[PDB]
Design a protein around this ligand. Structure first.
Ligand code: SF4
Ligand SMILES: [Mg+2]
Ligand SMILES: [Mg+2]
Length: 236
């Protein structure tokens, strides 16, 4: 009885489809994601590095007391750094923020990302990942949620559950974006549902340490449980 992670890609694709339907039954349309507008998501992402969620939100709102995006680009960089002093390493984040705001404005439209809607997906991804402090996960999240493009964001919860089950073998988070999207239909609502139900599952059941496999609807087809039973180790 071979592990899932060794099976042909067409079999691991069918497995991920079975996972998708079981997780939909458990969580329906619960949505734990912040669901921000694009500009807010990008800047929050930059602020979030090595920073708690509470610290991130406070730093963002404090940033916005400096004014609209125009004033923030024009503000002295020391003034920005002081505004975001609740987040970690404010001095290094202050200019990544201004850089990104400057590049956004220069693009067609104002402080808007609506031009991305009409670009080829690969090009749209690249434009976003080129932005300072923006990774492939946030780039994918913005494109899927805000502009309904067929890309699939892989956060720590999606990575952990899909690797434990054995949909993919062990690999880095960025490579897992390529690998998991290759197993999925180009269907944005389908991708969104799968993303958020993974989030709910990783938070409530398939946790970082001591997962609750006895309460898990995926148990009978999970590689990690087959290997370790009740003693699945912590994910890394
Ligand atoms: S059986 Fe355990 S390790 Fe496997 S997906 Fe469920 S909670 Fe995670
Ligand atoms: Mg613009
Ligand atoms: Mg980048």
């Amino acid at each position: 009885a071979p592990l899932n992670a060794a099976r042909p890609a067409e079999e691991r694709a069918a497995l991920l489809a079975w996972v998708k339907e079981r997780l939909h039954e458990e969580y329906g349309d619960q949505d734990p994601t912040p669901r921000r507008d694009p500009m807010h998501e990008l800047i929050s992402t930059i602020l979030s590095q090595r920073t708690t969620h509470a610290d991130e939100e406070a730093a963002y709102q404090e940033l916005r007391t400096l004014g609209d995006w125009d004033a923030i680009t024009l503000a002295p960089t020391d003034a920005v750094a002081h505004a975001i002093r609740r987040s970690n390493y404010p001095e290094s984040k202050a200019p990544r923020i201004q850089e990104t705001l400057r590049r956004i404005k220069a693009a067609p439209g104002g402080y808007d990302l609506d031009f991305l809607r009409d670009l080829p997906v690969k090009d749209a991804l690249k434009w976003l990942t080129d932005l300072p402090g923006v990774g492939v996960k946030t780039a994918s999240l913005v494109l899927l949620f805000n502009y309904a493009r067929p890309v699939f964001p892989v956060d720590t919860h999606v990575h952990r559950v899909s690797t434990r089950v054995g949909v993919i073998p062990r690999m880095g988070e960025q490579a897992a974006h390529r690998a998991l999207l290759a197993l999925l239909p180009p269907d944005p609502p389908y991708l969104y549902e799968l993303h958020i139900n993974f989030l709910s599952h990783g938070r409530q059941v398939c946790t970082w340490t001591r997962p609750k496999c006895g309460k898990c609807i995926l148990r009978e087809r999970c590689d990690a449980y087959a290997l370790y039973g009740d003693k699945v180790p912590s994910f890394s």
